[PDB]
Design a protein around this ligand. Sequence first.
Ligand SMILES: NC(=O)c1ccc[n+]([C@@H]2O[C@H](COP(=O)([O-])OP(=O)(O)OC[C@H]3O[C@@H](n4cnc5c(N)ncnc54)[C@H](O)[C@@H]3O)[C@@H](O)[C@H]2O)c1
Ligand SMILES: NC(=O)c1ccc[n+]([C@@H]2O[C@H](COP(=O)([O-])OP(=O)(O)OC[C@H]3O[C@@H](n4cnc5c(N)ncnc54)[C@H](O)[C@@H]3O)[C@@H](O)[C@H]2O)c1
Ligand SMILES: NC(=O)c1ccc[n+]([C@@H]2O[C@H](COP(=O)([O-])OP(=O)(O)OC[C@H]3O[C@@H](n4cnc5c(N)ncnc54)[C@H](O)[C@@H]3O)[C@@H](O)[C@H]2O)c1
Ligand SMILES: NC(=O)c1ccc[n+]([C@@H]2O[C@H](COP(=O)([O-])OP(=O)(O)OC[C@H]3O[C@@H](n4cnc5c(N)ncnc54)[C@H](O)[C@@H]3O)[C@@H](O)[C@H]2O)c1
Lengths: 384, 385, 390, 378
Amino acid sequence: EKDKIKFLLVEGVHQKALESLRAAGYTNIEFHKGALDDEQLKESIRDAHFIGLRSRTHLTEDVINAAEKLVAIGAFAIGTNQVDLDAAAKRGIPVFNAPFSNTRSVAELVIGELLLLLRGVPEANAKAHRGVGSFEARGKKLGIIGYGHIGTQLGILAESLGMYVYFYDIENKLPLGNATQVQHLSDLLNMSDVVSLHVPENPSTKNMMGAKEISLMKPGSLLINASRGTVVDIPALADALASKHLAGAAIDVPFTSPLAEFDNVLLTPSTQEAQENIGLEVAGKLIKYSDNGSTLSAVNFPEVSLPLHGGRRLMHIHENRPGVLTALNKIFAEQGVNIAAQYLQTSAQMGYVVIDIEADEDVAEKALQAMKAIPGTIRARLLY
Amino acid sequence: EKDKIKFLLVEGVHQKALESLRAAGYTNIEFHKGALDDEQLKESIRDAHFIGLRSRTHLTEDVINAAEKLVAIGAFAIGTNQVDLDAAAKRGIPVFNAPFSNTRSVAELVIGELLLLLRGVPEANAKAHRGVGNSFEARGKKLGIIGYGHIGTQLGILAESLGMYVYFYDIENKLPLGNATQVQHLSDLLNMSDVVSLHVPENPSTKNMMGAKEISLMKPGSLLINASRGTVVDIPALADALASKHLAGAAIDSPLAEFDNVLLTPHIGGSTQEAQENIGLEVAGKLIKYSDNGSTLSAVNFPEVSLPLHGGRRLMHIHENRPGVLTALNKIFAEQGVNIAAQYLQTSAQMGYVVIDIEADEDVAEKALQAMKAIPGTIRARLLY
Amino acid sequence: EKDKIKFLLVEGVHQKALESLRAAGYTNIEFHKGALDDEQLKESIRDAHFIGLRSRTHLTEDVINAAEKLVAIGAFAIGTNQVDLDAAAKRGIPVFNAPFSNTRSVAELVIGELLLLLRGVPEANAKAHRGVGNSFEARGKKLGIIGYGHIGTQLGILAESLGMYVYFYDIENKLPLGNATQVQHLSDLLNMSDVVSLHVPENPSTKNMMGAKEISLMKPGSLLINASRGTVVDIPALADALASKHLAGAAIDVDPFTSPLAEFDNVLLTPHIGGSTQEAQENIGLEVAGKLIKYSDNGSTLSAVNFPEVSLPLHGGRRLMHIHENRPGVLTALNKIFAEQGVNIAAQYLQTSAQMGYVVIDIEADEDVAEKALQAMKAIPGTIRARLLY
Amino acid sequence: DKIKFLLVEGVHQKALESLRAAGYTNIEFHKGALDDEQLKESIRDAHFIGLRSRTHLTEDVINAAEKLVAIGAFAIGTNQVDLDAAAKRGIPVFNAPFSNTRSVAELVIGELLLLLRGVPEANAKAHRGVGNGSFEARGKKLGIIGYGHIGTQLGILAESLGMYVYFYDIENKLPLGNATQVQHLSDLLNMSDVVSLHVPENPSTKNMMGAKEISLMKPGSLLINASRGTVVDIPALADALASKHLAGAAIDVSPLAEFDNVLLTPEAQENIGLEVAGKLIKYSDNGSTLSAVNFPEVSLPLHGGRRLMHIHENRPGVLTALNKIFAEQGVNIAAQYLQTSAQMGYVVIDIEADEDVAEKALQAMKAIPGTIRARLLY
Ligand SMILES: NC(=O)c1ccc[n+]([C@@H]2O[C@H](COP(=O)([O-])OP(=O)(O)OC[C@H]3O[C@@H](n4cnc5c(N)ncnc54)[C@H](O)[C@@H]3O)[C@@H](O)[C@H]2O)c1
Ligand SMILES: NC(=O)c1ccc[n+]([C@@H]2O[C@H](COP(=O)([O-])OP(=O)(O)OC[C@H]3O[C@@H](n4cnc5c(N)ncnc54)[C@H](O)[C@@H]3O)[C@@H](O)[C@H]2O)c1
Ligand SMILES: NC(=O)c1ccc[n+]([C@@H]2O[C@H](COP(=O)([O-])OP(=O)(O)OC[C@H]3O[C@@H](n4cnc5c(N)ncnc54)[C@H](O)[C@@H]3O)[C@@H](O)[C@H]2O)c1
Ligand SMILES: NC(=O)c1ccc[n+]([C@@H]2O[C@H](COP(=O)([O-])OP(=O)(O)OC[C@H]3O[C@@H](n4cnc5c(N)ncnc54)[C@H](O)[C@@H]3O)[C@@H](O)[C@H]2O)c1
């Protein structure tokens, strides 16, 4: 929304990212197919309002402090280990990544794994390669644990394969297609011919699939954990495979070493069709942060976003010290200006707040100046 | 989550709602299979903190103002015309409906409508019934979806199953389902589509968004579908495009009664029988979360607020929208010596609602609560946890 | 696949048809965007071995007999009202149409009908256009398919994708696709179905198979769809069932036959059904061009509309074909001919009709003997035409 | 109906259901396989025998039979049956050709999904301790060669996964869904990200996928052969794998054992039961030998009238004799379908006549030299 806002994109992010940026009115783009050298990065990033990078660019504390106009960082990938998160945060610079771009990919893999495991293909294949010398998926029940981005897309594909889909989730969800939410996990485990996990990594899920749960699964069933974490007690999984209670499994990958001996287990390890989704996803985050201040899904920043309801919108980033918010609201109160919406979120170190006001530019601009002055302020900006 | 919080459910909402309420720790439930007479409703709702009803129960201003403990209203259906929204709002009472349980039926409806419209069936059928004597496959056709949310995504899935190519336009990037493709400019989506279906909310950004200009950008001989909305399409313009034959047909909802190639579906806000379970789950969920964390997401007569749960203490304040409320709040926490961890204030009409998370002990939180209730213009405030 | 084989195509058949012919080695093609006048037609179809036409071409006996090289006619459409079937048959000229090109289109139509009928849209729509003022999801419902053939099968696939449970009744055992289930007894399929769709041909076994008794057997509040045909459903019984509300609605392909239904707002009457646009045109083009190619190369008359149907698998050797009047002695004459040449018949397929017979014969012999047999076969009394396919 | 049905190795209850459905009662069932002594005893008066992969139906056992009309192999196909001995006796052997269609289509989907992602190789390495392809299926093109039972069901599943389906066949096929026929094999091969073969085993398919065909395939593509034949030239495929021209493959079972990016593979008994039992019944009723594995295939449309069938040694003069019989009797032949195999000849003849005229032609047909058997079907 201004050709003065410079976007520096390196390591060759997908073209759709550029298409998205231009459609939103941001055409001041410096593009690079490969990584920049230290000296090249420093001079290109110096006046960049935004930088988009992948895995090879190292955004160290020094490079960041060197950038004098940096507003936000877009990690066009899932990982952000190449970016110094804390350094960016201290300067009020959010880092966005692409957390859901691999959704479809994981769903397809699960389908491929269950189809072959159900037929005992992995074991037959390993023996064939050594010189040594089974059911249809349709009509079978798939039990999905975690019915979110991946869980829902998987259920859709499973139904297309003629499977009956059931899911367990700690939250009530709207079923897509003929899927059925099962309230008790043990009930899901009992019915399921195939069980697939798609939950996040947290105390709630730590070893949720232990000896007991695996014991609850149907005799001859399959356990899939296509996306890597710590949700499955590997030793317990190994015992159930050795005992043959489970006819096979697929686990994302030592730690899985106990499974290496099993021919009926599939062990599987940002360079494919993911680039388009990533380009669209991350450019979108940069665009929205620029236009409306949304930090939803930022990885090193308090998360906030507010619907577009007209009026003027300002944003304030500050060290989380008592008195800042009081100073902020005072600016509008002592002036009789009304606040239509306000959303503040904090961390131990920082506080981020977006405010919608009913006023004209003059007042808005004036308010912005006062805001920047408030002690503890890191950055302040008038969004519209 | 207390067992003293009374839930009054009338007109026989699905048993799943009760199970859900019980699972959330709410067991103080009065349940009736049907509607009650004016006398019974008044007696039953007098001490009800929450009421769940359907289309028959008339929750009028009188009834509302008489219910002295009412905290929230849940319409276990889509419509809320039987509920006096403004009356409830004035009392700081949000009204929740079931905005998503009927997602699937709207998607199925659009598929049925486009399939027949494409073949010219509505027109051929109307003439056939009048005695007057008298097409395209959907397969390989492009479906343009405006608003890729709950309905758009499900519609896209069904359309791809019919062999159609799905493209969509939205005001933000959306993760696509199947082979659906996002299109950055609305004009481009309109240009390429053989069928355009609208699935967006009602609000200044969508009022008449499909006007004479947008409709003329649609492909010649295309179809426009507005399955369940309100004021998104400029009717005069649509009639004009139909008369000129720019569009081969449409489905909506008049000046359109003259067109045999237009399907008119008088009121669709009706929830299906198969959806009663989902509705019970959906609306009970809304009441529960409002009661527990103050979320007013999806409320139909209230500013929408929702703050992630990060422990600590949480307070909520409903008031007359005006400058100085927030400042009045800051001073109270300052005097009380507490820092605000998170805050979310939204306004709608002449009303303001704000949820505040603070780190403080029970006593301090209560003292803050009493002060907050004394702020002039305050409608009500409570300590959620 | 020689070059002396001419293809006359009028009324602009789809390019796919030509691509198909060429790929098959038939390049001698005379294309025309539209129909030709009586003078031009006779002039063009003069030395044409094959002709492909549509609806705007009248192939009369005069035109046909005028043609001295015509071996087969391609009607790139469903109907063949425009061609003199008997005249072609008398000349030993088979007529091929596009029997299954509209399969997908009908299956799509059924889905659209049941979706709207299930929600009561036809009725609400009719009332709305009149000023008068004013429902179940398809997902989870059971679809009962009577006749699991071309359409039945594609319909079932679309229904399952819509989340419906598919069951079908057919007089012959079928390999179900997806989760489809074959039901042995009609009464059973009829009792369990929320929607029943008919996709059977018009023969004695189907004549009014859906009578008052069958309809009464249907689940109360169900839908009946017959999106093609005309003799499988008893309209009077249907109207009664709709009047009593035993059925919630219906879709019937339409007319004195459907008049009893005109008063029902919850019934969809749909005329034109057979020949969409470029899309249906592409299927048709590929289908009929294929028929012509197969007839030319191996003598197959499967699906011909005015000819005995014969089709013999390709097993090498020499292939001859003989078209004749159904008079006695022809079959005997054929044998005698091969005995004298001391040739063995590997396979023979003869089929007949009114007063005409068609036989394809596979023999073991050198071209030399083949051609000698061909000439002999042509001299058989009652012979209309004979050819050496390969 | 003195039509005894001997069933061994325990065929699914459905076969029994089916036979009964057609009145055909009299069923000697044996959950297990009988032996030489008992087998000859039970098969002695057996009209139809149903067996699996273990029964050894030798020339002796068959010769032992005296009323055997057909043999139903309720399995992947013929097994320990002396097909040749069976044919000599004018006895067709029916198997279950399309019963596991769905199963093969599902297998191909599973294989291409993993191969596209390089999982086979990654998995092989992971099981050897080593650590370290990869693409989604949606948006990719699947090239099917042989658009028949399996090909069509495969296309349906492929499209549901978001793939674009193209197929090549030797005749025009009605496409299901968005499947598109491609006229030239070379075009199909080059455009495909995945090629799967579903063609019959015969001369026109033997090694049809050679060095030339494989070189025409897109670089980094996958070749899948679930067929039960030798359609692919392994030596050529191996070369294409070593050179990385192909990113992987899946084949039924070696030179490919060295390739980690190659998949090597080996209750539905209900289908088999209903399919095979269905062949046995149709043959008894209308004489159809469609799909028989050791018999000329003949199938004639039921158009009323009388239907006579004749099985004979392929001696010249049989057809001459047959047609002379009807000629002399002044009986018109409505339809006639004769097909032959290396040793046998089978013809079905439809005529317009009453019982009298029929049985008259039947006795004369039985008297022809080379006759193995002849029956009045109806
Ligand atoms: N989607 C992607 O692109 C991607 C990429 C890499 C890794 N992952 C990983 O895959 C997993 C799932 O990802 P997603 O995108 O579908 O996540 P998601 O957030 O959309 O859904 C996770 C689901 O799990 C449910 N859940 C949480 N705790 C649960 C519990 N204890 N029991 C049952 N259900 C519970 C949640 O309510 C939610 O519906 C996560 O571990 C994620 O980190 C996803
Ligand atoms: N889901 C149901 O059961 C149901 C029942 C009756 C009526 N409706 C109506 O259908 C509409 C959409 O419902 P939904 O469930 O899909 O809602 P939703 O919130 O899930 O999705 C609406 C989508 O519209 C997009 N959008 C918003 N403003 C837009 C604009 N100006 N231009 C383009 N896209 C825009 C949003 O980003 C979002 O993705 C609403 O008007 C709703 O009242 C829904
Ligand atoms: N497929 C098309 O393109 C097309 C175009 C125009 C009209 N039609 C009409 O649609 C109908 C069906 O067409 P189709 O292409 O699927 O035909 P089809 O021949 O493929 O299948 C008809 C099915 O009906 C079954 N059947 C026959 N008699 C039966 C009986 N008495 N009871 C139960 N099942 C019986 C048959 O076994 C077969 O499976 C026919 O009336 C046909 O004329 C089809
Ligand atoms: N369907 C099953 O259950 C099953 C089980 C085991 C093995 N098989 C094997 O799979 C293969 C195909 O099985 P199906 O059931 O789909 O057979 P099918 O007969 O239904 O289809 C084979 C298809 O191949 C086409 N074709 C023939 N020769 C061709 C050629 N040279 N090039 C291209 N296409 C050609 C045919 O026209 C036909 O459409 C066969 O080898 C069969 O023995 C099938």
